[model samples]
Target chain A: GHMEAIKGSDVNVPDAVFAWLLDGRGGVKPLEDNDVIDSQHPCWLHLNYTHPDSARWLASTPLLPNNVRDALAGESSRPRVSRMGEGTLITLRCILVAMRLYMDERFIVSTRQRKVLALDDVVSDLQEGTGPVDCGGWLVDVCDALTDHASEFIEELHDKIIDLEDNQIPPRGFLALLRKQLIVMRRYMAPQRDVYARLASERLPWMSDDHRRRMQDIADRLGRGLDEIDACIARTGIMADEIAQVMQES
Target chain B: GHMEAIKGSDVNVPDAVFAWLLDGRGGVKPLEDNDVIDSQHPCWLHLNYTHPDSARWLASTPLLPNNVRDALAGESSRPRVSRMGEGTLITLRCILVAMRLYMDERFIVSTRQRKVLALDDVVSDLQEGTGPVDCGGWLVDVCDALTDHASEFIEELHDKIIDLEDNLLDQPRGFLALLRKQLIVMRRYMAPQRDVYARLASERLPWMSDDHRRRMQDIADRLGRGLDEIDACIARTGIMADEIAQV
Candidate 1:
């Protein structure tokens, strides 16, 4: 009985679209020029809560199918195929708490070429995961799904940055969008790294030999991703140092 | 007249014994009586002019007994030896500064112990400089001298502690005695260790063949002694901890 609630004021989708989004049905509705969908809006949004008193909430909602929810809620909601008693539950959240300042600060509308390269590799791997032989492997399936989602997320961020560059939105506004995208990516990357570390540590008994091998490979890949992110952080630190030095000189 | 004013309170002794003692000609004196010969006490109390006025006074001190005065007045005064361009001058201090703490708030008959140790070792070694064969050459002599001094120092300390135990000194009194001993030891050890390090690092000259090796050996020995003292200190710490636990 996992349910999420979202406020009607924040989203531009119609009531029927919102209902369909929440109903776990698969459907693609026109997102452009929708009357109910606001191009710019500000208000409290309602989203379904797992607990009535749970205070933490997010505004951006993922349109998930009903089958995915059931799989998540089931006794064995393992991301990968597992024994009946041993399944993993994977959840993701995107943080957009401070959006406005983020948009204002970073006016550099550059698409990450490396991320695009990674996305291409991920999509190729996803295609491999969809082969008939790998159909029922839950781990592979979930990984493929996450990879697909991440690729789309990156694409959307790229589009938003492009729009900002075209002066469709204020720099501050676009910076906020970029910030939210990065925050979400960071959050997902952390958990993914943790999962990989755990798998690589070989502490789980239920992991099949083949699965363990795959997990190790995935862990190595994730480690590389983490390293890349760390390099970016270091670059940012250097930039910050330069900015501080400039300010001091001034 | 290389006679300088004796700084401390004058304690009288026979002239013969004083002369013999200075020249290393006298037989060792036994500690049988309290009022034995202190004689002129050599220039037993060495002073440095840390203050400007004191430095002026020291500078004004008569430069008679030209050789002895030069040895004493020059910047190069060592533990056992000093040079005056012609001959060497030797002197040593037999210091014994002890601390006495009173029990409770009142000072009745406070217990005390002598803090300084191994004056005899310093005397004997200086008397028998660089020995016959120079054991492991000059470096060996330096190493031996330092090692002998350090070992004798600790041994004397150990003996003093044993004597205190035999005397049944109060724990607090015994501790105060040890603390004073440690302070003096550290003061001397620091200077000696610095001297050794400097010698080891300095360029080779007259008596320093493989000067680095010898001086390093001396440093190592000093370090070992320091570490041993540290262990003793830790033992005291443990004793204090136990006392706290008991209380």
Candidate 2:
């Protein structure tokens, strides 16, 4: 039996995509609907935002307000954050997909319109008993995974531009598509920078100072990502002009 | 009589949009199909490239080859140049419109699907006896006019971006459209136009004098400067848009 597939396919709940009961010590156990509500342990639930059962399950919970539930299920993609008491509502961008979450002192709930690969990293860690200690720690893990993935994505595009510049002349369509990708990245990340800043500066009772500092670093890194995208756009313009001049001469 | 209206209403040929016989000394007179063919003086013919009469008129002319005629009535927009013998085929950009031309020692022929306002500047100059002396000088005037209009257009946008930055936050859609405009300019018009100027500068043509080439070089440099300014403007708008999102 493939243990990896076994851990990955453990979605028994109707709408809950991934359920985990944190042991408070870096370990987790697979959980279900009643297993989550009836138990006293801290846990995480990743849900499909469009599923009616997900909305129904969220409605039955008295821990969160209707606004938080709606936001977690809403279509808004621009990253944002709202804090209420010790609970926080967060919306984060994973490329074109948005990962919405509600985190409190005890548990955290995440919902998404599409599958987020970043979330799988967190799931893999949970399966290996190498996951977060608490809800706040899980939030930090998710942030780190998302930031790491974004950085990698940018590096890939950045390398592609350099390859085009050195080895070959890029097609006009290629430059246009690169410009489009840069614009798409700017649309999400610019506002997401604000979200990270707020998270880093505003304190949650469960969030440690170390977590806040890490979030600050994430925000700064995201800023650098934006800067790199701007640089790519600049270089794209230069390459396009060079190509035009070369074509005319030839 | 309405002389202004008379000057405006002088499209006497079937597909020739504007016909003028340039008097070498900067003056011009209106001409018909036969008037251009039989006349010994230098002239300019602006044609509607899509019309069959335009192709027929281009075909009957012995001065230009089939390739030059085809290019003049052709649809290629990205600014380009091809020299054959003493004649040169040019394809220039006018926003979305492609303004194609075939110029030689004696006369020039221009064609386009859409009207270009920059050509009107040349028309006005000719009307006032302030136009170029020969075909090469006319080419220089055209380059000057196109570059001037492009410079003014970019300044308008650069100023608008500044206005948005200082006053209030612009709508996301507006900024996106602005970015689109910048990309559109880069795609065909600005970069290629600059190349066209640079090509004119370096290319050796009998009719184009050394001084004329120097002028072309100046225009090439000016267009290059315009491209740099546009890149800077794009960067500024991008940063402004990002800050708006941040807020």
Candidate 3:
């Protein structure tokens, strides 16, 4: 019935479009914010960013600390994570999608302009009773899902690079495409690496030592993948130059 | 007559068009690599990449490690640095200009396929004997020179970013393309440069003095900060691009 249109007609998105309240087990049920408090159980709320209610709720939410509030609705696109008063604020930027999540021991609020498939995957896991045990675990789980997409993207780019290098003379557009993807990927992923490392560096009341190490491992994995991308860009650049050199000589 | 003619006359730049030997003081003298040994002062050889000997000597230089040889004569375009034997082989890649340098305690060798103003600037300092006294010192000195140019470029780019932000609403028709081009070019070099600086920051090279690490940290910070500035520019550009699409 396109009920979303009527609900957000006034930009009233303070309550998320997809809401889930954690059941302490791997199971989650449809969340109703009326009776739940931070002391009870942690939960997640996925809000659509296009609605004015999302912007207003994020910008003026009294519950969110100032930095978290501003960042939740901030224009900066680079991914980053910062510890904010007993909670965490994170921005994870990928090609065509940017996700911002604000979380504490008991709640996770995520906002996205377009639906991210990785996030959707996590939603299905929760719906099937195979999701994370708690909100903090959800944070790490979603990060892994995002990085999984990042790895696939880099692998595809690498295959393209190999094909171009094998050819005697490839179309110049291949180089242009390589360069563009390299630029945008490094922009977000580099910052994402730094953000995860920041999360790993200190103590989190909600996350255990093992959990922090798990996050560090994610950072290391992303960093290694990005390093491969760097090599691919350099290799492609050298190949393009060789082609140009031959053309100039001939 | 041009001795460089005897070297490589086919635009054949051999015998480094500009060569100098560090007098170990604040000046440099014309280096005659004649009868040189490790005990004596180190020297610099600058050769144009177009010359056959410039290319040949680098390929066959027995003193050079295999990594140094391949890097100097190799086709890789991105800049990199690797530790070889007791020396460091470094490459700094810039627009249309690539300079690959190799240095140990005995000699500081640099080769360029195209003219680099920064490298030329450092050459004059060596010619005047006002340059570094050792191979490791050359590493720091030329890196400083290269970065001086790099810093200037980043400042200019930052100014442009300001202009784009200031007029974002009524962005010029080609404004997005212009910004994207600048970002990509600077980014290519800047990424590799940050890697080089990061290596210097944590690595414990035998020849590096205490002062070297101090200077290295400052340089690393500058490079890291410049990268952040580029990211900021990228974000602003992306925002403007989205706005343009919406309109």
Candidate 4:
């Protein structure tokens, strides 16, 4: 329980799935005297939360602050951020899966319950030896990656909404379905926006000026996405009402 | 359309529903005994939103600010608050109705679309010569009042959750609906109110004393706890839901 990894895990995480995110950001390569996870180094540790080894390790030494670690491996994920023992705690309830990340000057740790493709995309980038060079780089990339997947889903819904708009007789319960989607997205969407705004305003020593701008950019994108979500819900509401009006007139 | 009251109000406010809570407090005198609602006096205005005259008066020039007037009058009735020019705008949707309030150093204006019991209680306090004396006093009072009402709803839920724990097999059929609806209302309303409290606590308003800031800090704490209570209720309900399902 000292400042070291808990050697015994209930479940084994293969060395092949482990990574450095630097030269071999590649998954699960057994360590070759790696400074990739050195205490003083600014690096990202990506882990699978459901792995008993991961949980056992997380509950062990050199782990994240309690605030961040609490979300690190739990179900309390409604996209929010708070101070994590002088660090930053970010919890994102992504459409694909929930993500909890802790970023401080010392190191960065992220964990998820299952395989979230966005994490793969990031690790894939680092594995190519061509992604984020520093702290600001990776954090923003991850958030941007999250919204990237989110954007695809949102855009799909946006188009379907257009299709619904063109329909002569609206499908049954189309309006209700649209509302349910909006409500579900909204529960985490606004809080994510709040998290971004809060994070951007922080005067952290590690984040660069450009990093701040990018953080703001991601938040702005998230805000616009949210606005579009609301727009779809509103348009559907009006369209449904208009159809009801037309039926009544008939 | 002139500086005078518009002519088509369907319901009458009887002028007595308004009174002043002074040395700084005052209210429902129907603009009589001179227009004491001048630039200097701090006052409160409570009206039924259904009152046509009230809406017309609200949108008038000599009344509230444009930003405040819009929220104050009709049915943009979501629980929200925004910057009212240089002041603060608060719109609240209670379990029963909606209440909008605009507060600054000079005067405080509140409007409602229906009869909310809280207003009657605040009014009754003014009529008795013991209520908020100034800007901070009333703003804090209003927020505290909203949370007070929320607390009552939560306490009732707490009692039910306890009863359910004691007799899980004998649960009432409507318990789920009661808990669900209350949880929905809390999510819809309390979160925004918490944001407003945080904003208010941070704003460097001249009329706000350190005392007001301290009070808002307390109210904000209560608002968040209110949200947490709702969450706890949902967890308990979900657990009980599983219990019932398993049984």
Candidate 5:
């Protein structure tokens, strides 16, 4: 039956981790490979980039620009935004998962090795007919979801730092781990914030002025959060110093 | 008078920290603002990007793409390579200095808040008629110089690590400083290595195939030598901590 279903689709790309076609009314329909190729409707495809099937599909696909194909299949890395032809290639990482996304006016192709909880919420929104109407809107929605996740993660880290601060002198191991986490977050956040800022400046014909403003809003929010992260990191260092003095004395 | 010399230059860009015109035969002549405006010869200009004069000059000049102009004057960060129009904008940092460079087929424009020692060597080579012949060659030469500096710095760090290792019970302050330095190097080095790899993949008509391979070779060299050794050093510190607790 599964084979029959696969055969029913005009084009069978078994490597799609998830596929959906926009329903023109802020909803999405479950998409098969045939839907992507034959249908005129805009769609989204998620792939596990590590699979050879994905590599072959991405490599051979005439839909994406060559550079976008390379970036989707390339190594995991820091955030960057590059506009090649009509498509924008975005490389991004959240504390939860790394993502490589290529989007144009018509389609969104995203690759990742791990699951993003944010994408799950996006899927839910689309299913409920509350999602974006266009690929540009979809990109913004995904970014907003990611920023929300970062905010929550930052809040949790802030709470932990507060607890550690109240403790006066937390355990050495716990403090060290918190410090490492802060460093890791700041490292990724600094560049990610830049990516968001840079994206706001990119003049995409398909992206609306409000969409650009939303991107800037995300950048500013991240900027403020980054300051909080920096403060937390500083406090941790000071705490480490105080602990070190105690260690030296004892 | 200094004013007369400034007036003699057809275009007066006072913010230029240094300027040079490339001689056809692997040499360079000290360039003036006038030389840049009227000369057919390729040239290089280094600017103090913090100065308003530099901003005015960069903004008004039709020599660079708009994005490259913005990048040359933007806030400092990790390394990145962006191609706009015929120009390539490069953001790079050495342990010594931060550099922003933009180059096309004809001219090279570099900006920095602080001095780069590598640029001094490049200047020396150019003056001696022993340097690269084109802008692409100049870019590669500067990158090679930066990599050499990184290699030397890594060697120095390795020696310090060796000292800390031999001491067994090194002073806590000394050990911590060494560890911090290692972390700093690894942070910048990783991204820089990526930029080199990415640059190698970019196809620029002006750049030779040999130039791309040199970039890949630099990436490979840095790749083989990241901070796994420093990670090992950190692990060893845990054992030292156990010993400290016992005592």
Candidate 6:
């Protein structure tokens, strides 16, 4: 039976095996044209599997946008926004940072064709203006603020570098401190790049024109910041290597 | 002989003697010239055990900043940036997100009596064109951007909340969906605050300037966005709490 085949088949078959099965020459020629599968598809597809009897029930339910379905199923990991057909699909990176734990997750916002994605709730909350000023900005504002903080942090770190150079200490403690500082630099550098990359890509049509420019500017800053980190890291590496060589000889 | 002391010290000491010695007190008399110790003394004072040979070798080294030495060896775990005598001591919080690791390390940046502290390299890279911008200006830009993003994200999240409210599904799934949404709001809220606090506190002094009030205004806007996130989280929390109570 159809249920038996779907259930009994090895779930993790290799790509070749799957392709062979799909090929008309192998065994089954269920459809004459694969194009039929492509053209007749709805704007969204939803899949739900429960009990054997519920499978039939699932078929009767309304389908959803493929982006939404994929997001809900956790099939898509990266945070992105894209225009698909007549609609828009947006994926946002959600993070939680506190004293005990830090977690990263994603959420998607999808809109139907020609429908403007209204962020009424966000606007309302901003207009109310009750919490910390950090929360008041649009999406771009948040990313820009983070970049600013990262920039300041890096500045403080640079001052420490000069101080370390001025105060001549034993090679070991100096190297250790340098390594620690670089670690901090690298930690924030990667995510900041990713955030900026998302903005620069400009896949989301929902972003307002002014917001998009601001996001792009942030992306530019992030790119320059990353270059700076790389240069510093390289310079530090050279210094540490030279010292290590000198120590080895002595 | 050194190896033997390192390995056998535990067994040689009598239990009572070890216990008494372990307590941080001994028969040493208080200093006769307390003022001398209190005043700027160039000589290094030995607090505990001092080997005669090691002391002779150590005496040749130049005098170091006491504040810097203490900060490096301090027991406190939290990350802090503060002004010390003639220098600034910063304990930066560094986290490796993938490794889930956190460490607190101190950095001491000293300034000459009258010279300005050059902190641009510390905060960011010094490229020819992309050299460091004013900290306040950078902060303002970021705050403005983040607040704008939050506003948009909140609106989308609100729509989801409304949809959840309208749909009648299994209570657990509905609650789970709501929980996930709240988690998103909470996560975005914390990152900006950490940045804003660091700026307002003037921890990164050279970057933060009094002239950049406009930039400060932008930070203020970003903080406003964070409040919105908190409100949404609270609203969702209340809703979820109510549902859980019913169950």
Highest DockQ against the true fold, candidate: 6
* Superposed model 3: Cα runs more than 4 Å off: A1-250, B1-14, B33-40, B164-171, B242-247
Better of 5 and 6 by DockQ: 6
Q: How closely does chain A match the true chain A in each prediction, as TM-score?
A: 0.38, 0.87, 0.87, 0.82, 0.87, 0.45
TM-score winner between candidates 4 and 6: 4
Off by over 4 Å in 6: A1-137, A170-203, A245-250, B1-247
How many residue pairs clash per model? Answer: 18, 0, 9, 17, 0, 50
Off by over 4 Å in 2: A1-14, A32-40, B1-247
lDDT of each: 0.33, 0.71, 0.67, 0.63, 0.67, 0.36
Better of 1 and 2 by DockQ: 2
Interface RMS for model 5: 24.0
Tell me the lDDT of model 5 at A219.
92
What is the docking quality class of candidate 5?
Answer: incorrect
lDDT of 3 by residue, A1-250 (tens): 1111112122224546566667777756555435353524566777875677677777776557876765666454778777767778888975457898887776777887654656744654554457787766887878878888788668767765675565456543557767778877887789898987877777777776777888899889999988998998788789778889979987
User: How good is the docking of model 3, as DockQ?
Assistant: 0.01
CAPRI tier for the interface of model 6 = incorrect
Predicted structure 3, TM vs. truth = 0.49
Writing each residue's lDDT as its tens digit, candidate 5 over B1-247 gives: 0001122153346767877777757888887644532123566888888888888887877555554567788664656565443456778777656799787656778998878887878888987999777666677778777766766765666566666657765536556455644644554344344444445445443444575566656653563354334334434443444554564
Model 6: per-residue lDDT, tens digit, A1-250?
0111111121211211011112111111112222222111111111122223223322232232433443433334343444444343443322212000000111111221111112222322332332112111235554565566556555545545555544533334555655566666676566646655665565544355666677788778867876766666676676666666767887
Per-residue lDDT tens digits for candidate 4, residues A213-237, read 8888989998999988888888878
TM-score of each: 0.24, 0.46, 0.49, 0.52, 0.47, 0.34
| Model 3, C-alpha of B162: deviation from truth (Å) | 2.9
lDDT for each residue of candidate 2 in B1-247, tens digit (9 for 90 to 100): 1001122222244657867777878878876445432123566878887788777777666555554656676746557776543457888876466788887665677888888888889888899999887777889989988888888877777787777776654434687455635643553366657767887988776667898999999998898777657756655664565677776
Candidate 2 lDDT, A12-102, residue by residue in tens: 3465765667876676665554453222356587888778888776666666776776787765667989887667889999858789988
Prediction 5 TM-score vs. true: 0.47
Candidate RMSDs in Å, in order, are 32.3, 22.5, 17.4, 17.7, 22.2, 21.5
Q: Best candidate, lDDT-wise?
A: 2
lDDT of 1 at B202: 45
